[PDB]
Design an enzyme around this catalytic site. Structure first.
Site, PDB file in Angstrom:
ATOM      1  N   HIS A   1       0.746  -1.268   0.000  1.00  0.00           N
ATOM      2  CA  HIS A   1       0.000   0.000   0.000  1.00  0.00           C
ATOM      3  C   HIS A   1       0.773   1.313   0.000  1.00  0.00           C
ATOM      4  O   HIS A   1       0.227   2.339  -0.383  1.00  0.00           O
ATOM      5  CB  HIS A   1      -0.953   0.035   1.177  1.00  0.00           C
ATOM      6  CG  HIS A   1      -2.071  -0.947   1.063  1.00  0.00           C
ATOM      7  ND1 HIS A   1      -2.971  -0.922   0.018  1.00  0.00           N
ATOM      8  CD2 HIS A   1      -2.432  -1.988   1.851  1.00  0.00           C
ATOM      9  CE1 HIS A   1      -3.839  -1.904   0.173  1.00  0.00           C
ATOM     10  NE2 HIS A   1      -3.533  -2.566   1.275  1.00  0.00           N
TER      11      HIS A   1
ATOM     12  N   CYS B   1      -6.025  -9.531   5.080  1.00  0.00           N
ATOM     13  CA  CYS B   1      -4.773  -9.039   4.527  1.00  0.00           C
ATOM     14  C   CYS B   1      -3.542  -9.806   4.990  1.00  0.00           C
ATOM     15  O   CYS B   1      -2.617 -10.022   4.214  1.00  0.00           O
ATOM     16  CB  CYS B   1      -4.567  -7.563   4.885  1.00  0.00           C
ATOM     17  SG  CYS B   1      -5.853  -6.427   4.255  1.00  0.00           S
TER      18      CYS B   1
HETATM   19  C1  HEC Z   1      -0.405  -7.108  -1.121  1.00  0.00           C
HETATM   20  C2  HEC Z   1      -0.129  -8.612  -1.132  1.00  0.00           C
HETATM   21  C3  HEC Z   1      -1.091  -6.543   0.098  1.00  0.00           C
HETATM   22  C4  HEC Z   1      -0.653  -6.489   1.377  1.00  0.00           C
HETATM   23  C5  HEC Z   1       0.636  -7.006   1.986  1.00  0.00           C
HETATM   24  C6  HEC Z   1      -1.670  -5.780   2.112  1.00  0.00           C
HETATM   25  N1  HEC Z   1      -2.746  -5.419   1.273  1.00  0.00           N
HETATM   26 FE1  HEC Z   1      -4.379  -4.406   1.748  1.00  0.00          FE
HETATM   27  N2  HEC Z   1      -5.043  -4.594  -0.118  1.00  0.00           N
HETATM   28  C7  HEC Z   1      -4.430  -5.221  -1.176  1.00  0.00           C
HETATM   29  C8  HEC Z   1      -5.246  -5.166  -2.384  1.00  0.00           C
HETATM   30  C9  HEC Z   1      -4.842  -5.772  -3.697  1.00  0.00           C
HETATM   31  C10 HEC Z   1      -6.357  -4.475  -2.024  1.00  0.00           C
HETATM   32  C11 HEC Z   1      -7.580  -4.066  -2.801  1.00  0.00           C
HETATM   33  C12 HEC Z   1      -7.332  -2.786  -3.688  1.00  0.00           C
HETATM   34  C13 HEC Z   1      -7.262  -1.588  -2.943  1.00  0.00           C
HETATM   35  O1  HEC Z   1      -6.159  -1.169  -2.494  1.00  0.00           O
HETATM   36  O2  HEC Z   1      -8.314  -0.926  -2.721  1.00  0.00           O
HETATM   37  C14 HEC Z   1      -6.202  -4.115  -0.618  1.00  0.00           C
HETATM   38  C15 HEC Z   1      -7.136  -3.367   0.099  1.00  0.00           C
HETATM   39  C16 HEC Z   1      -7.035  -2.983   1.425  1.00  0.00           C
HETATM   40  C17 HEC Z   1      -7.991  -2.185   2.115  1.00  0.00           C
HETATM   41  C18 HEC Z   1      -9.261  -1.641   1.506  1.00  0.00           C
HETATM   42  C19 HEC Z   1      -9.214  -0.165   1.072  1.00  0.00           C
HETATM   43  C20 HEC Z   1     -10.485   0.449   0.896  1.00  0.00           C
HETATM   44  O3  HEC Z   1     -10.457   1.674   0.484  1.00  0.00           O
HETATM   45  O4  HEC Z   1     -11.580  -0.111   1.105  1.00  0.00           O
HETATM   46  C21 HEC Z   1      -7.525  -2.029   3.401  1.00  0.00           C
HETATM   47  C22 HEC Z   1      -8.132  -1.281   4.557  1.00  0.00           C
HETATM   48  C23 HEC Z   1      -6.269  -2.765   3.461  1.00  0.00           C
HETATM   49  N3  HEC Z   1      -5.983  -3.328   2.237  1.00  0.00           N
HETATM   50  C24 HEC Z   1      -5.472  -2.882   4.596  1.00  0.00           C
HETATM   51  C25 HEC Z   1      -4.276  -3.579   4.676  1.00  0.00           C
HETATM   52  C26 HEC Z   1      -3.472  -3.704   5.888  1.00  0.00           C
HETATM   53  C27 HEC Z   1      -3.818  -3.099   7.233  1.00  0.00           C
HETATM   54  C28 HEC Z   1      -2.400  -4.451   5.562  1.00  0.00           C
HETATM   55  C29 HEC Z   1      -1.267  -4.891   6.446  1.00  0.00           C
HETATM   56  C30 HEC Z   1      -1.715  -5.970   7.440  1.00  0.00           C
HETATM   57  C31 HEC Z   1      -2.523  -4.765   4.152  1.00  0.00           C
HETATM   58  N4  HEC Z   1      -3.696  -4.242   3.617  1.00  0.00           N
HETATM   59  C32 HEC Z   1      -1.591  -5.486   3.436  1.00  0.00           C
HETATM   60  C33 HEC Z   1      -3.184  -5.828  -1.103  1.00  0.00           C
HETATM   61  C34 HEC Z   1      -2.387  -5.923   0.050  1.00  0.00           C
END
Ligand code: HEC
Ligand code: HEC
Ligand code: HEC
Lengths: 138, 261
Positions: B181, B222
Site C-alpha cells: 500500500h 490481509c
Molecule cells: C499485497 C499482497 C497486500 C498487502 C501485503 C496488504 N494489502 Fe491491503 N489490499 C491489497 C489489495 C490488492 C487491495 C484491494 C485494492 C485496494 O487497495 O483498494 C487491498 C485493500 C485494502 C484495504 C481496503 C481499502 C479500501 O479503500 O476499502 C484495506 C483497509 C487494506 N488493504 C489494509 C491492509 C493492511 C492493514 C495491511 C497490512 C496488514 C494490508 N492491507 C496489506 C493488497 C495488500
C-alpha cells in the site's frame, strides 16, 4: 535428486549456477505454474506478453519480457530461490526459503504452520519456471 | 476517475484527496480515499445512497438503534438520543483513548461494552453483520467530516505499536501493509488497483462478497493473504493497527459505508 532449500549454493550476487534438480526444467509446465495463484502466482505482479492469454497481469514487478536477454540463467534462478539476495527489500516473495518468516500460515487458511515449512515452490517447479523464463529472450 | 469529486446524495462533499498527515509526509505527497482507485462504474455506487447496497444495512441499524434490547429494557436511543446527533462526529475520532477503560478502544468495543454492561444484552460478534451494520450507521452520520484520530498523548504507545505492525512483513510471502500500500499504490496486483489501504471508508461494502466488511475483517484477510496467521479480531494488535491506519487517513472524509471491489 534435488538440492534442498538449506543446501543451495548462492554466490555474492545472489546467483545460483547449479540447477535445484537433475530433472531438466519443462518450459511448458513452467508457463502454467506462473499463472497458478496456489504456486507461483507470478502474473499477479508480472506481465508476460508472450502469455497472450495471461489476463490482468500486475504491474508491481517489471514486465518479464526479455528477462532471458538481460539476466543469465543463474541470476534468474537466484531470483526464484530468494529474490532478496538479488533485490534487497524486494516485495517479491522468496520461493525456495523455509526459515525466518514472521507468522507463516498454511496457505491461505490463516492457521499456523506446525512442523516442516515447505518452500513456496519445489525444486522441480522452480526449474520448470526458470526453463520457461529462459525462453523469454524476446 | 482518480481526481473526480465524490459527493453523496448531491449534498455530502467527501474530501477524497488530502495533504499527507505530518507523521507520514515522508512517504507520499497526498493521501487518497480508496474510492479514487476504483473504476467509474464502481465509484458511481457510492455517490448516492439508493445505489449503495451498504446503506440497506444502515437503515436496518437505524431500526435496531431504537429497539429495546437486553434485560435493562433499553435501546441505544434511550441513552444516546437520535443517532444522527448522539453519534455525530464520533467515527472521526475513533479509535481513541477511553478513560474508563484506560486503553484505546474501538467503536466496536464501545458498542459491545454498552451492550453487556448497560443494556444487559449479549455481545455482538465483533465482525458479524449486526455489529458491522451498526458501525456503518455510526459512520454514515459523520460522512463528510475529517477523520481526526489523536496519535499522541495516552494513545501514543498504541499508535506506535500499530505503526510497527504496519511495517512488519508477515506470512511466507513475507509482506507488510506498506509493502503493497505504500510502495506500490497505484500499481496493479492482478485485477486489483492498489490503494493506500485507507480505512476512512469502513465498513466497506464490497462487490466481491455483497456485504459490509469491518476493519478487523479486512486486516485479518490481509495478513492471511501474505500466507500468514492474522491476529484475532478485536485483538490488541488489530486495535493498535486500526488506530494507526486510521491516522494514515487523517484529513480524509469519513466515507463509510463505502463501495469497493
Ligand atoms: C499485497 C499482497 C497486500 C498487502 C501485503 C496488504 N494489502 Fe491491503 N489490499 C491489497 C489489495 C490488492 C487491495 C484491494 C485494492 C485496494 O487497495 O483498494 C487491498 C485493500 C485494502 C484495504 C481496503 C481499502 C479500501 O479503500 O476499502 C484495506 C483497509 C487494506 N488493504 C489494509 C491492509 C493492511 C492493514 C495491511 C497490512 C496488514 C494490508 N492491507 C496489506 C493488497 C495488500
Ligand atoms: C509481487 C509480490 C511479486 C510476485 C508475486 C512475483 N514477483 Fe518477481 N519481481 C517483483 C518485483 C517487485 C521485482 C523487481 C525487483 C525489485 O523489487 O526492485 C521482481 C523481479 C523479478 C525478476 C527480475 C526481472 C527484472 O528485473 O527485469 C524475475 C525474473 C522475476 N521477478 C520472476 C518472478 C516469478 C517467476 C514469479 C512467480 C513465482 C514472480 N517473480 C513473482 C515482484 C513479484
Ligand atoms: C445507557 C444505559 C446506554 C445505552 C442503552 C447505550 N449506551 Fe452507548 N454509552 C453510554 C455511556 C454512559 C457512554 C459513555 C461511556 C464511557 O466510557 O465514557 C456510552 C458510550 C458509547 C460509545 C462511545 C462514544 C463516545 O461518545 O466516546 C459508543 C460508540 C456507544 N456508546 C454505542 C452504543 C450503541 C451502539 C448502543 C445500542 C446498542 C448504545 N451505545 C446503548 C450509555 C448507553
Amino acid at each position: 535428486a534435488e538440492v534442498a532449500p538449506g543446501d543451495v549454493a548462492i554466490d555474492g550476487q545472489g546467483h545460483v549456477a547449479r540447477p535445484l534438480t537433475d530433472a531438466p526444467g519443462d518450459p511448458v509446465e513452467g508457463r502454467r505454474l506462473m499463472t497458478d495463484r496456489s504456486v507461483g502466482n507470478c502474473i499477479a505482479c508480472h506481465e508476460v506478453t508472450e502469455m497472450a492469454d495471461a489476463q490482468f497481469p500486475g504491474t508491481v514487478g517489471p514486465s518479464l519480457d526479455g528477462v532471458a536477454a538481460r539476466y543469465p540463467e543463474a541470476m534468474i534462478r537466484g531470483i526464484l530461490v530468494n529474490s532478496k539476495n538479488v533485490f534487497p527489500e524486494t516485495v517479491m516473495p522468496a520461493y525456495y526459503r523455509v526459515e525466518g518468516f514472521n507468522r507463516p500460515g498454511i496457505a491461505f487458511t490463516s492457521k499456523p504452520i506446525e512442523g516442516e515449512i515447505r518452500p513456496l515452490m519445489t525444486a522441480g517447479q522452480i526449474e520448470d519456471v526458470v526453463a520457461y523464463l529462459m525462453t523469454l529472450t524476446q | 476517475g482518480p481526481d473526480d469529486p465524490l459527493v453523496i446524495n448531491g449534498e455530502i462533499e467527501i474530501v477524497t484527496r488530502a495533504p499527507t498527515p505530518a507523521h507520514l509526509a515522508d512517504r507520499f505527497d497526498e493521501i487518497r480515499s480508496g474510492w479514487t482507485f476504483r473504476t467509474d462504474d464502481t465509484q458511481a455506487l457510492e455517490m448516492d445512497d439508493f445505489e449503495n447496497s451498504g446503506m440497506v444495512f444502515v437503515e436496518e441499524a437505524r431500526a435496531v438503534w431504537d429497539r429495546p434490547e437486553g434485560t435493562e429494557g433499553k435501546a441505544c436511543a434511550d441513552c444516546h438520543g437520535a443517532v444522527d446527533d448522539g453519534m455525530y462526529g464520533l467515527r472521526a475520532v475513533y479509535p481513541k483513548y477511553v478513560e474508563s477503560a484506560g486503553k484505546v478502544r474501538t467503536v466496536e468495543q464501545m458498542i459491545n461494552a454498552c451492550r453487556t454492561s448497560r443494556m444487559g444484552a449479549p455481545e455482538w460478534d465483533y465482525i458479524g453483520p449486526d455489529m458491522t451494520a451498526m458501525v456503518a450507521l455510526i459512520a454514515s452520520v459523520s460522512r463528510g467530516m475529517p477523520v481526526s484520530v489523536a496519535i499522541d498523548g495516552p494513545a501514543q504507545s498504541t499508535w506506535e505499536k500499530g505503526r510497527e505492525i504496519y511495517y512488519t512483513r508477515y506470512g511466507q510471502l513475507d509482506l507488510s501493509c506498506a509493502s503493497c500500500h505504500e510502495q506500490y499504490f497505484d500499481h496493479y496486483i492482478r485485477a486489483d488497483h492498489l490503494s493506500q489501504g485507507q480505512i476512512n471508508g469502513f465498513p466497506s461494502y464490497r462487490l466481491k462478497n455483497a456485504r459490509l466488511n469491518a476493519v478487523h475483517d479486512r486486516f485479518r484477510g490481509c495478513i492471511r493473504d501474505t500466507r500468514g496467521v492474522p491476529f484475532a479480531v478485536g485483538s490488541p494488535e488489530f486495535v493498535a493497527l486500526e488506530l494507526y491506519v486510521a491516522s494514515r487517513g487523517n484529513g480524509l472524509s469519513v466515507e463509510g459505508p463505502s463501495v469497493r471491489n
